[PDB]
């Protein structure tokens, strides 16, 4: 359970190649060893009647590339040849320079030689140029060439296009994926768009309770504020009673100075008596010593300070018996305060503990909250950036789709209608198709051929957006007018010259645009092929 910051730091970031020849030994449709024909960089076709084994080959290339659908069906399956111990199929790849003229000047270096030996013991082993490997290494070198194998887009079968004609706009379950999520994978966002959505979701819920933590560190705060206010009143009472107590020490010091000033005056008078009668001076000395005995209270032990410290006006302000208000009001104030003291440092303790240290906890949860808001808006920025890239590529491919549909249908427009313009990730994207010289209507009331024509228009749109060098089609000519067949054949011939198109059909135009015509026939259940032009 890494933090989202560690997660957001750890974010994983988001001439041509031709097939020279294919040789197949103990192949499912080929008896013994058969060499497939040469394939031009421009065009090639495998034309013939249905049931000659073309479907067997196009499923075989899925089998040999790791796409799995008793490994004896992988070997030949017929009457004359039936399930020998192993089959070996080899395909040759070479580069070729992209020239506008009709050239077959390949690069003589063999780029790839993928040989799969599939035996009857449920074991299939892959070799690249005879080196015992997997299809993963061939796939990595194809990704170096810009070709992605496990993200399959280059192969089109029929079951895909009659899936396309009745797609839900979104994949409502884990086993369904709409064109929205598949395009999100295509555009390069689905690696980081949806996982960051689910990741921020849970973290924000964890963050919520952190905001709740910030709440219940001080859920009410009024009880502690009232308690520290009362104890602050007690502390201010302590300081004020200390000041009144200092005044009381001053008043007791006024009593000691009244006694001592009286002592000094009577020393002066008894010294006058001694100057002038002896026993009268002795009586003055006795009363002076009695007052010095009574002077013990000069060490005022109340706070010992005003104990020995005198005020300014010694003959007038330094007597306590002449000011009974100073005697009475100060001790009355002291008694009222000491009755009303209840002192505690809980004002300071609660202020430094719950108004500062729990405020420090609130500040730490404020920092966690700033992390939470930074995480949620870094999410909002990343999700909106991936969404903006997704709808930007979506606008690019819909412009390419609409221009392809306009030049293929020679009129009319098929356009994808969003559920909502802001974010079509809610429940999908609908599709509305207009046939030429027809009213604008839903796709559901239209022909299946119109749906397939819009699907091939989108396929042309994604190929124009992202150049995939290989494309495979099968039996598009059925239930379709020859006009659109020749139109898309002319599109494939004219707009694409480097891109190689392989189509399985019987109508003339799809191989009249073809540079290679691989005429394949099965005579006495022995399959032989010729490569005519």
Swiss-Prot record:
Residues 364-384 form a coiled coil. InterPro entries: P-loop_NTPase, RecF/RecN/SMC_N, SMC, SMC_hinge, SMC_hinge_sf. SUPFAM superfamilies: P-loop containing nucleoside triphosphate hydrolases, Smc hinge domain, Tropomyosin. GO terms for biological process: cell division; kinetochore organization; meiotic chromosome condensation; meiotic chromosome segregation; mitotic chromosome condensation; mitotic sister chromatid segregation; positive regulation of chromosome condensation; positive regulation of chromosome segregation. ATP binds at residues 48-55. Keywords: Acetylation, ATP-binding, Cell cycle, Cell division, Chromosome, Coiled coil, Cytoplasm, DNA condensation, Mitosis, Nucleotide-binding, Nucleus, Phosphoprotein. Pfam families: SMC_hinge (PF06470), SMC_N (PF02463). GO terms for molecular function: ATP binding; ATP hydrolysis activity; chromatin binding; single-stranded DNA binding. It is found in: Nucleus; Cytoplasm; Chromosome. Widely expressed. Higher expression in testis, colon, thymus. The modification Phosphoserine is found at residues 72, 311. GO terms for cellular component: chromosome, centromeric region; condensed nuclear chromosome; condensin complex; cytosol; nuclear speck; nucleoplasm; nucleus. SMART domains: SMC_hinge. The keyword Coiled coil applies. Forms a heterodimer with SMC2. Component of the condensin complex, which contains the SMC2 and SMC4 heterodimer, and three non SMC subunits that probably regulate the complex: BRRN1/CAPH, CNAP1/CAPD2 and CAPG. Belongs to the SMC family. SMC4 subfamily. Central component of the condensin complex, a complex required for conversion of interphase chromatin into mitotic-like condense chromosomes. The condensin complex probably introduces positive supercoils into relaxed DNA in the presence of type I topoisomerases and converts nicked DNA into positive knotted forms in the presence of type II topoisomerases. The SMC hinge domain, which separates the large intramolecular coiled coil regions, allows the heterodimerization with SMC2, forming a V-shaped heterodimer. This is Structural maintenance of chromosomes protein 4. The gene is SMC4.
């Amino acid at each position: 359970n890494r933090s989202l910051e560690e997660i957001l730091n750890s974010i994983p970031p988001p001439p041509r190649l031709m097939i020279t020849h294919i040789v197949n030994q103990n192949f499912k449709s080929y008896a013994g060893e058969k060499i497939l024909g040469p394939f031009h960089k421009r065009f090639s076709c495998i034309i013939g009647p249905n049931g000659s084994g073309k479907s067997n080959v196009i499923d075989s290339m899925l089998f040999v590339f790791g796409y799995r659908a008793k490994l004896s069906v992988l070997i030949h399956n017929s009457d004359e040849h039936k399930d020998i111990q192993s089959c070996t199929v080899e395909v040759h790849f070479q580069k070729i320079i992209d020239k506008e003229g009709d050239d077959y000047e390949v690069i003589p270096n063999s780029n790839f030689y993928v040989s799969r030996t599939a035996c009857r013991d449920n074991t299939s082993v892959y070799h690249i140029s005879g080196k015992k490997k997997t299809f993963k290494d061939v796939g990595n070198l194809l990704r170096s060439h810009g070709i992605d194998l496990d993200h399959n887009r280059f192969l089109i079968l029929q079951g895909e296009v009659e899936q396309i004609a009745m797609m839900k706009p979104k994949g409502q379950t884990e086993h369904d994926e709409g064109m929205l999520e598949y395009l999100e994978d295509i555009i390069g966002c689905g690696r980081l768009n949806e996982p960051i959505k689910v990741l921020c979701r849970r973290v924000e819920i964890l963050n919520e309770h952190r905001g709740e933590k910030l709440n219940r560190v001080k859920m009410v705060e009024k009880e502690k504020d009232a308690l520290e206010g009362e104890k602050n009143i007690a502390i201010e009472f302590l300081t004020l009673e200390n000041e009144i107590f200092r005044k009381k020490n001053h008043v007791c010091q006024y009593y000691i100075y009244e006694l001592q000033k009286r002592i000094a005056e009577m020393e002066t008078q008894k010294e006058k008596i001694h100057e002038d009668l002896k026993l009268e001076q002795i009586d003055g000395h006795i009363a002076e010593h009695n007052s010095k005995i009574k002077y013990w209270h000069k060490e005022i032990s109340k706070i010992s300070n005003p104990i020995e410290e005198i005020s300014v006006l010694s003959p007038e302000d330094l007597e306590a018996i002449k000011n009974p208000d100073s005697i009475t009001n100060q001790i009355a104030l002291l008694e009222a305060r000491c009755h009303e003291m209840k002192p505690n440092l809980g004002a300071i303790a609660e202020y430094k503990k719950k108004e500062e240290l729990y405020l420090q906890r609130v500040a730490e949860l404020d920092k966690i909250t700033y992390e939470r808001d930074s995480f949620r808006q870094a999410y909002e920025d990343l999700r909106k950036q991936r969404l903006n890239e997704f709808m930007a590529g979506f606008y690019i491919i819909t412009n390419k789709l609409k221009e392809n549909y306009q030049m293929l249908t020679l009129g009319g427009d098929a356009e994808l209608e969003l559920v909502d313009s802001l974010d079509p990730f809610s429940e999908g994207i609908m599709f509305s198709v207009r046939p030429p010289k027809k009213s604008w209507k839903k796709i559901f009331n239209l022909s299946g051929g119109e749906k397939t024509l819009s699907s091939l228009a989108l396929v042309f749109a994604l190929h124009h957006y992202k150049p995939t060098p290989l494309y495979f089609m099968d039996e598009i000519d059925a239930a379709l007018d020859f006009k659109n067949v020749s139109i898309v054949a002319f599109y494939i011939y004219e707009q694409t010259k480097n891109a190689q198109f392989i189509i399985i059909s019987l109508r003339n135009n799809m191989f009249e645009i073809s540079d290679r015509l691989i005429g394949i026939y099965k005579t006495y259940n022995i399959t032989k092929s010729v490569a005519v032009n």
